[PDB]
From a paper:
The AAA+ protein [name] and the peptidase [name] form a major bacterial proteasome with crucial functions in bacterial stress resistance and virulence. [name] forms a hexameric ring and threads substrates under ATP consumption through its central channel into the proteolytic chamber of associated [name] for degradation. [name] is usually repressed in an inactive resting state, where two [name] spirals interact via coiled-coil M-domains. This study reveals that the NTD stabilizes the resting state through multiple anchoring points to M-domains and ATPase domains.
[name]-WT formed three distinct species in presence of ATP that corresponded to complexes consisting of 10, 12 and 14 subunits. This finding was important in informing the cryo-EM data analysis and guiding us to classify and refine three distinct maps corresponding to the 10-, 12- and 14-mer at a resolution of around 3.8 Å. The three oligomeric states aligned to each other almost perfectly (CC of 0.89) on the “front side” of the double staircase while they differ in the “back side”, which is open as a cradle in the 10-mer and closed with a seam in the 14-mer. Upon signal subtraction and local refinement of dimers from the 14-mer dataset, we obtained the highest-resolution map (3.5 Å) of a [name] resting-state dimer (see “Methods”) then merged into a 14-mer combined map. The increased resolution of the 14-mer resting state and the generation of an improved AlphaFold2 model of the [name] [name] monomer allowed us to partially refine the full resting state structure and to precisely position the NTD into the cryo-EM density. Out of the 14 ATP-binding sites at AAA2, 8 are occupied with nucleotides (7 ATPs and 1 ADP). While loaded, the ATPase activity of AAA2 will remain low as the highly-pitched assembly of the ATP pockets prevents allosteric arginine-fingers (R704) from neighboring subunits to access bound nucleotides (average distance 9 Å) and trigger ATP hydrolysis. Seam subunits NTDs of the 14-mer state make contact with different domains in the inner surface of the assembly. In particular, NTD residue K85 makes intra-subunit salt bridge interactions with residues D356 and E359 of the AAA1, highlighting a possible regulatory contact that connects the ATPase domain with the NTD. Each NTD also makes extensive contacts with the MD of the adjacent subunit (MD*), mainly mediated by a patch of hydrophobic and apolar amino acids and one clear salt bridge between conserved residues R9 and E435.
Residue numbers in the entry:
A (entry chain J): 410 to 478
B (entry chain I): 1 to 142, 159 to 247, 255 to 279, 281, 299 to 594, 601 to 808
C (entry chain H): 479 to 546
D (entry chain H): 159 to 247, 255 to 273
The structure:
Amino acid sequence: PNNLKEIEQEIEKVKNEKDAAVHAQEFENAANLRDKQTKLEKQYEEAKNEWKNAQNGMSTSLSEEDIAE
Amino acid sequence: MLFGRLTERAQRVLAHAQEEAIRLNHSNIGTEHLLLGLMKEPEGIAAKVLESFNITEDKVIEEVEKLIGHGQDHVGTLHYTPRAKKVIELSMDEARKLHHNFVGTEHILLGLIRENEGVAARVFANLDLNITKARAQVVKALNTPTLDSLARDLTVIAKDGTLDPVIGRDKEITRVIEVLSRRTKNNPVLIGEPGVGKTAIAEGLAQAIVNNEVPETLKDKRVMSLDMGTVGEFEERLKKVMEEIQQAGNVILFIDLILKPALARGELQCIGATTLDEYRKNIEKDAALERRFQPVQVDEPSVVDTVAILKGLRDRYEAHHRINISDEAIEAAVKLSNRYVSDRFLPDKAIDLIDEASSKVRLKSHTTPNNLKEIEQEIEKVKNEKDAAVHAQEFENAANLRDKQTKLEKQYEEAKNEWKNAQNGMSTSLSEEDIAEVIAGWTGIPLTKINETESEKLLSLEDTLHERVIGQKDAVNSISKAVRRARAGLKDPKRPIGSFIFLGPTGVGKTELARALAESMFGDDDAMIRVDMSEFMEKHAVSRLVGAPPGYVQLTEKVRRKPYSVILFDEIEKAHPDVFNILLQVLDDGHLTDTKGRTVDFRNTIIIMTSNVGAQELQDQRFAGFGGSSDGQDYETIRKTMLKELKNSFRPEFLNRVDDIIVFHKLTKEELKEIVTMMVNKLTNRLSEQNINIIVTDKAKDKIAEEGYDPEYGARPLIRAIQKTIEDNLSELILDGNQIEGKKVTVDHDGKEFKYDIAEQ
Amino acid sequence: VIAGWTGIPLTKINETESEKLLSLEDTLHERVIGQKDAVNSISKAVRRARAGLKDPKRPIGSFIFLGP
Amino acid sequence: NTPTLDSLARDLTVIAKDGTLDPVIGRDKEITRVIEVLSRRTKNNPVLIGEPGVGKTAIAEGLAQAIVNNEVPETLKDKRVMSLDMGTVGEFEERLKKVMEEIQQAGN
Ligand SMILES: Nc1ncnc2c1ncn2[C@@H]1O[C@H](COP(=O)(O)OP(=O)(O)O)[C@@H](O)[C@H]1O
């Protein structure tokens, strides 16, 4: 639902940014990025779990409209 | 994988370069703008590399300001120069060389020096810095094996990002995964003609897997393809492979003709790509296989769709050739390639057309314009002379030669620098005219014919037809109005361009008019497929034009290869009735399907049928009275009367589907005079090398016109009369050791025969 | 050299191919006595094609003969 | 410098550099077409097609001639003209696999 998409993208760019710091020996910034990534993943798990939890709230059923299409 | 790899420092470099162009008043961001913004971020690895080289920000500011160049600019559409985009491709490529998944400022400087043509490239060269010196400087500062034996993974390659972004297949990528998520018939088979890009579908799906767009049900699956050429011994290999795939559980097979039980048990999810003809012959007959495959049709993208596809790849080609490509150039390229080339479909044929167009203009504007070649010869000749002087112990003479040669080399660099500075001043954009040149060579069509805008050509069709056809203006007006209505859009697009019936005396211009129409519309005289009903009289004749029926060993093949042509059906009044049934289908449906299932098109064709009926009715009007005729009646009145005879022999249902009916008149003495006039002009241009002008008097023209005068045979004998009279005498003059050379020959009938007055031009 | 390669007569080589056509009528009647109409018709046709009146791509000679 | 390619294949750009053989004259369109194809991005690998006996091998000499003349653009600069010999070619495929490693790395 257009939420875990962008959140996952931020995790990707953060990981690349940390890799650049590691190869450049900029460990001062790398330490901050490591904690930031953990923050992103922590909220990522909660956001995904609540989404699938709400998915079970409603049941997807077919209808003659779908077959008509 | 561009935005996802550029680090924050690299992103700030692009932002700095954008405002550098604003300060310098440039409407396009050049390579030199990247260098200016690069020095404003002294934190990256590249900053350390230049630091060890004692290269400061201000030193390169004045270095680039020597040949910066200044001019006017337009706010908006501040794109990158064709060379600038090549730098980004180079820097990203160098990242994979070092096995880096990120692109930073350390790679921006690495790629800048590899351009070798840009402004920034020369700045580094002037500081005795090359690619090799900076290369090592930054280095120190920094499973189903049997299945894999005869196959190739695809999503692994797509992970690298080297694959071009497949566009326009989104409706089919979703379609394929839709078929997969089914309990039955979960094995889609792509059906289409070869070369339309069926293999490109697999790459698009694998790209979505890497990009994380497929749902969880289609997440983390190894895309695998098996080549048909990899094949007792053959049977042993496949048995081992299928067992391994069953263990993995996420291997998607890709094939292109034992294994039937494997698919019946739901063990494999192969995606075939065989042709329609083979599918109906080897798969359709098998009921078990039929219940396990869902064919998916693969079609050529539309013209408007191809525009978007080419725009996506436009940036990629702008880097390789360093050639600016305009938007209007792309739309012209695809439309013209589809219009004339009809052998490879879109977009695989439009991509190469713009590829050769960019390369062609690249070579012409790259070679030295005879400014450094002359100087190079001067340097070379002095060197050889000086070497010979050394062997002669001419030390004093060699001293003068040394000074001269040094001066020549001094001017050589100056001329090269100013020549390339001027080259960088302008943009080597691509024009649609250049594209028209390449396609013109591919077909031999004159560039003027291709350059026609198709708008005024339709308006002036009446005049153009009169050039090659003389007389019967009523026929010309009716057909010209008919075709311009269909092209204007007033007719159903699926219906053919036009359908007509030609009547009147035989050999009066019926064939010539069709040739003239084909030349004027389609730009070629021989763009006609003449078909005569002489061979089509029996019922079995229908199995000839449509192709051989199954179990056995024409027209559909010809029209498919030339979608833009004029089809002529002579002797339509004498044909098998079953052939008429096919004709009615073509007029309304607008397309046909052969025995092989391939569908031909008729929306770019004009159908003309020649019938011998009604001609005897017309001559009955000519012989109704002794010395009179019915030419003074209204043209529509004659059309109504002839329609009665036309419906007498044919079916009224067929006639109602015909756009218009054309009836040709007779020929008179005055008309025949102008007929020979055209042929004289044609023959004059025939021997254009000799440059000989022939003028025939009116009396001589009338003398030969009546010689071939035969209303029964029309104007057919007229051509033969000229061949036996003027050609025979003229040829003998040339055979006599070129008797006439650039002279003028006048033919005047003196009362007995044609007096061949021999004179000069 | 060419005469000794394929046995071509030297006189034929010396011909300029400009008067052979002029004497075609005499040569044809040497082996085909009579039927003058069949000889003059084809003799006056080859000159037109060789002069360049006909299309160069199309073959010079194209005829169908009738009779026993 | 692809040492294995030099041994298992014949090098022609060196011969063209010395100019010992007669220059190719008359094949102006063929040479200009090949360089045009090599400057393309897609399908930029031309293949010479002709009847056996029109000296297609001699045509390849003209391409190397332009390099020595320094007439080809910067894109074609520094490209050794190497021709494989069928005399040298399991064990058959060992040689081709060994040579292709150096060719890809060199890139010129
Ligand atoms: N400009 C012209 N105007 C009128 N008639 C022409 C013109 N040019 C050629 N023709 C005539 O058109 C005729 C075409 O004959 P054609 O229709 O093929 O005969 P058939 O109908 O028996 O096949 C030629 O014999 C020629 O004399």
